[PDB]
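Q: Hi! First time asking for a complex rather than a single chain. Here are the components, and I think there are twelve in total. Is that enough to go on?
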Amino acid sequence: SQIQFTRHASDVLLNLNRLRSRDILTDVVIVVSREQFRAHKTVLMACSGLFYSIFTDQLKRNLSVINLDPEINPEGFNILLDFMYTSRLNLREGNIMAVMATAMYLQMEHVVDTCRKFIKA
Amino acid sequence: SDLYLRPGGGDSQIQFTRHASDVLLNLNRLRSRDILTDVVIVVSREQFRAHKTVLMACSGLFYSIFTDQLKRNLSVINLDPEINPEGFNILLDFMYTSRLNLREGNIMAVMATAMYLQMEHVVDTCRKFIKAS
Amino acid sequence: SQIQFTRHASDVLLNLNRLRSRDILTDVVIVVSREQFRAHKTVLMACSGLFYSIFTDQLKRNLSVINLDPEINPEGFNILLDFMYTSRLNLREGNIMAVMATAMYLQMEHVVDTCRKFIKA
Amino acid sequence: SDLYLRPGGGDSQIQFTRHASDVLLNLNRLRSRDILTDVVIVVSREQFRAHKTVLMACSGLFYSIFTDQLKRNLSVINLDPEINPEGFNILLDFMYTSRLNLREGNIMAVMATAMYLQMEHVVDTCRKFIKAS
Amino acid sequence: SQIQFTRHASDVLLNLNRLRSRDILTDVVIVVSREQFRAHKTVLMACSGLFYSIFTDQLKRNLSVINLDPEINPEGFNILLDFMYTSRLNLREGNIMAVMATAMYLQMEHVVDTCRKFIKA
Amino acid sequence: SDLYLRPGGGDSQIQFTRHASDVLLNLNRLRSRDILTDVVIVVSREQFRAHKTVLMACSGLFYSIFTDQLKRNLSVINLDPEINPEGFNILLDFMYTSRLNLREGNIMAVMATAMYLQMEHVVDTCRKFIKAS
Amino acid sequence: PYFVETPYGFQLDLDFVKYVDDIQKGITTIKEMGRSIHEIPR
Amino acid sequence: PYFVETPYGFQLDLDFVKYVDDIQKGITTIKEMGRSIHEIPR
Amino acid sequence: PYFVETPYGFQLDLDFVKYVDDIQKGITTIKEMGRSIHEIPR
Amino acid sequence: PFTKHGQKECDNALRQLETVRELLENPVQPINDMSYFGCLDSVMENSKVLGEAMTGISQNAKNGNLPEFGDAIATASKALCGFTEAAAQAAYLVGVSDPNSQAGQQGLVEPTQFARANQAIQMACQSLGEPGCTQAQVLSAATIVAKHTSALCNSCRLASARTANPTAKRQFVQSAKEVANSTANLVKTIKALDGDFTEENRAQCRAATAPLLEAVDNLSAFASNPEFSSVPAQISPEGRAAMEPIVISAKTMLESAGGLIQTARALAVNPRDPPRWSVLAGHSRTVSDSIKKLITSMRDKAPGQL
Amino acid sequence: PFTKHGQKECDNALRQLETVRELLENPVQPINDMSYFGCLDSVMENSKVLGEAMTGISQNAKNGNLPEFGDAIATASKALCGFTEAAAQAAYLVGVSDPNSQAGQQGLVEPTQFARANQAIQMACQSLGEPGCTQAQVLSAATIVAKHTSALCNSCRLASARTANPTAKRQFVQSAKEVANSTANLVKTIKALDGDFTEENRAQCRAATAPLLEAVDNLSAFASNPEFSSVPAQISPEGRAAMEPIVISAKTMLESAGGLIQTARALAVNPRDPPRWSVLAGHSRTVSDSIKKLITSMRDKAPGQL
Amino acid sequence: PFTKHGQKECDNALRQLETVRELLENPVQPINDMSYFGCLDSVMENSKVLGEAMTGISQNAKNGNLPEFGDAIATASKALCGFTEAAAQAAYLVGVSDPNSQAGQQGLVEPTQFARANQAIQMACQSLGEPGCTQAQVLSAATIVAKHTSALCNSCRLASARTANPTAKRQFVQSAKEVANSTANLVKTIKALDGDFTEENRAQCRAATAPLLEAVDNLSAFASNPEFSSVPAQISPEGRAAMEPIVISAKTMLESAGGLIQTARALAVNPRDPPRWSVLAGHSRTVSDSIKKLITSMRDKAPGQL
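A: Yes, that's all I need. Here is the structure of the assembled complex.
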């Protein structure tokens, strides 16, 4: 017999969010502009194709601080980082463009297409 | 006259339902390719490489091991010798796949290792199986 | 003045029964058939003339196990052993003969005569 | 015709009232003849042989001494030097005879040794005597 | 700014009375007749001009026992000692003369004049 | 005839209101003249002679120090090095004079030393000052 | 020794009273004032 | 999930029920059953 | 400072209030604002 | 005389609250195998259950419907039990997490389920051959104890899978097969001796219970050995100070909810009592405040966060 | 205004329950000199007394008869006090029985009976020569303190029979004879000074109290010395874990029985209250359950049995 | 529906009693900076206040006047809180006074007032630039947090005056001047941006909050360092035995007074209830007895007297 724990996948992500909220084993600091963002490399690579290419690079796998491009909006990246740990993408009547632009910078094409669908209506 | 082009007002939240499953699947792909595996779990001369964050998200024991400061940055973790290697192997595969393979033979080592790793939900599932067969 | 504690004798026997029920300082095992019976040698000698003759024998005073005759009924001996510690002799419409026979085997003549009186009525 | 010969039916329990007194008297005869005396109690260079089971059935202290595993199989038990030998002698004779001999002179050592041996019923009796004389 | 704690002076005397009632750091025993009186030298010198002259004497500053004159009334001195620690002078229709006489022996002239005022009425 | 001369009957108690102030003033005169000063308080190489009984009557710390038996008959008491000498000086003068001199500069060391000496009433007064300026 | 009736049908739980009785003894009882066991000579 | 009405106007304090809700999430919610992130090859 | 009367004759036990009074002092009281003891010169 | 068959729910629920209260008095070994995050999930889920239970207690006792009142009383009881179990488990983890604390291993066996299973066959020995319980009754006398012998083999099996010594693991498997094969010899006694049972084979049916009882006695004697005895952990002074805010809020939750159910009992008998509804309102706030302080303390005191 | 002279039994009984509760908070030295088996006998006998008391509480408060209600309240109080004393004594014996525990010797003297006896003569010194308590009253002023001086010699005598140091035993006998012979000198003061007491010999009657008071002060000062100070035992972690089931069941018994007497107080004032009888029924079950768990725990946890 | 706006005083007062009860569970570090004699003065003065409060509770709830009832309930609450604080402080001093005890230093900072002040600016960051809280509201959004930034400099200043390390004292003064000068740069943002605020200078008003928030985050991170962490004292077994009589009497005072206020709540809703007045009379005696035993224990157990 093979038992399927349907709620297991959501519990792991929630516990991973508990570890980030408590700075437990956060192994990287994503610096955008002047704001600090600590997270787990494994979660960043699983969600963002950009961060996957960064930490798969052997010369950049053991980096403690990652400084993004200055044009990246900090609040837009924060909504994406919160989406990686909570499966919730919060879009406002203003930040929707900053979230859409930062999503394609992080190579998260499915989040980009979702913002393309929402900007239509 | 003129007209304004705005995507409405207020707030909105998009719920990606299968996002949690995609993260766990991608994390399992990283383990199968040995990508950023930060710890190796030795169970009776049998090694198991995985991610510390995933072990703490599923096992209450590994949470206690890596929240310990003098054991947080440990490369190797040797479990007790009374832990069955395949019993821990079934649980580790369950952590990354949400699949618990139980038979009438391995359920002894699975539940015994489940309560050792402090996985109450798995222990209650194994107890339900035994109380039904 | 000499104060007479009337309830003292019953309290000692009750406490001696508490020690047997908890296997506290039980220094002999009376094996009848295939059943084990642990008790105190001092209580056995005080009540049974047979056990008195056994443990007064210098070559049998320090025996840990005492195997009775196979013809002795285990349930009949149990009622006698319980009587030694509780002053209560339980007789049924069946075991009365096994208690009477085991009593005279243990050389407890007063218990034998009591069973002789009860079998009359 | 025929007829059946049975001693009735049901159950019955015979209560030997003076059985407890006969056991204590026989136990005292064993002590006077030094039969299976398994311990000797030394009270200020004065020895007293008795039965461990009887000491535990009467004294809460001797119960604590022989229920102690590393003191259970002890041949000699040396009490505290502040214990009066005759005060303990009156109590030991009381354990086997249910007789407590109290005078206006020895009642000091009797009650003091009674509470040392943890015999609350004897302590309350001595306190009743003093509160009456 | 200079803050005036009005209740401070009464709290120090009350605490000094707590120390005397508990024999805490009582450094002298004032023996009158056959009665013992333990107190603090600093409180005795502050209130009594006699005790001030005694402990200011270099050859009598480190004396543990001070034996007063036998003619001094012990109960009269007790009322004065209690007054030093409680600011309360208890006068009866009898002990008023013993308090007045012991006060002038202790060189407490203000307490003497108070007794002179009370004996008038 | 005759007549009797008695100062009435019953009891009477005379309350010297300013007696407590006169005792504290006389005690302060003894300290200024170094009369029976039984202890010297060192605060960062700065000495302060006073009376032990007065220190215990005002400071809960000095009460704990001299009620300690192995520290009761101590001639010198060295406070912690983090204690400001003038902050303790303002408090010591307050113990003998009931005067607390507070400014916007010294109130830091006064309240910090007040809670070190366990003087809750002084701490609450300094907290009232800061919550008003 | 198990339950007693209060007003309005409620009870007082005396199960501890019966629990002590089961410990003290545990159907007809018969008394015998005669000597029960042999007497040991001095 | 905050207060419920009992007879005579009194309340039952359910502030802990709302305190748990603020932890679980914290206006329109939109579901998306499509894949959220890129899939990693084996 | 000992007992106060509630409806239906019951009391409120204030023996602790009187117990504190016995500690603070313990019949006519007389005040004297004059100096009590000698003043020590500097 | 009424509401008598609705009070039992209140009486039994309070007893269950008295029992879980025993977990909070001195945690020295874990209550279960819950992760610390699992304790947060358990506390938050039981709070969702307790909320619906309290609303059911008030609305039922307001206007009859005593069966639903008994369900809400039992629901509130089990929800508070889950509160205490997760709070005691979390409080233990916070205590041992201190670097100056010790660990307390749990016993390899529980000498309580084996004691009740021993009485299941001890009191059944004389209950099948004395003037009290005669023949015929084999459907009940055998099944009520066969469930315990099968649970004996299950509990003894998992007990071997946790011990490190193969000497014990071999003995546990041996002792489990002794109770099993002795019952297997009793299967033949149940196969026959149905109607033809006038001492036709009852001498052999008891002959199969003799190795069934002496092997259970042998297994129970082995359950009280070294290593199997549980060891309490040594919580450091700082570990005791960190776990108490979770323990105190959990103790206050039980004592406040017990008075709520006690007040709900009086209001279930007669709801027309404004003072009693005021006391329930007062207990409902102290219950909610205790839960909020309990969840907040468990969140702040994670063994990882400072 | 009624039932006022029946409430005092309830008020005083609860205070006695608050006092014995102090024994269970931290047993570190024995409450008395009871054998462990004597604790079983005391608990079982007090349960027989408490049962009859509770039935008397309900049946009295049902229909007046307040004097019998006060007797049942006082009887239930003293029965619960015997429960707590035997439970605390047994809990201590279980704690020290652990091989990794320590022993705690009790004080050779009790500096409380000597303190009350000191005030019996201290407050009697000025009460025989001041404008408040005059002459004549010698039947009461002498007998109420002579009982304490005789009890002083009795307590000081048995205190010598327990100390090992003959230096103290000689001093106890000496101090006991000082209080006795000083009172013997006061016997002559009572022999005379009956009617001819206008300062005819009162100067010598007080002259006999001066060595009577200073010898009592000398005896009280010697009671607070080394060795005489009690030492608490060091209960091991396993010893603390074994004694708690007896302590917890004893704490629950007192807190549940206190609410029963408190509910019985309200029902004694007015029995027509079905909700109040329901609360009493709920407390009666928690009381019975606590006693059953207490007796069962004391039986299983004998210092001899495993 | 009535008495709803008078129950809040009873509900909030009991919560305050539950909070001070947390001080008595395990004193290991002092509650405040009170002298032992100051604890006697505080207990005796609060007893004078509690007496007048209880008389006000009864006489108000007797005949309406619910506003005065709420004042007496709140007065009795704060008086009992002063009882517990002085009792816990005295109990600690008695414990550490034992020659075989240890000392427990209190934390140099309190990481709770800085946490609430952090949320005063954290929740105010997005509350000044999102579709929820717009412009205009600068009188409230600035003053409610400026009081906390000024209290931040006050708390950080006195925290430096207690540390021995000048490295921390220099950093505390530096961190206090960082929050001050960053707010000083915000003074210019309040000087302007009043009516001409259509993004005319709001980009610079937030530019002054950026060093105001990151310096507060820097100060809060430094508050959780070594030395600053409080250390619990090690109370000896004899020290624990001496402090418990003060702790037990303090625990009994709170639990008895809580039931008094709880009974006073029911009598405030409806005073015509003789059984309820009897329960209040019973709690009033247990309260008075607990206070008398508390004051007597604190007087006898002075750290100086034997």
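A: Residues 15-24 of chain G form the longest helix (10 residues). Let me know if you'd like any chain examined more closely.
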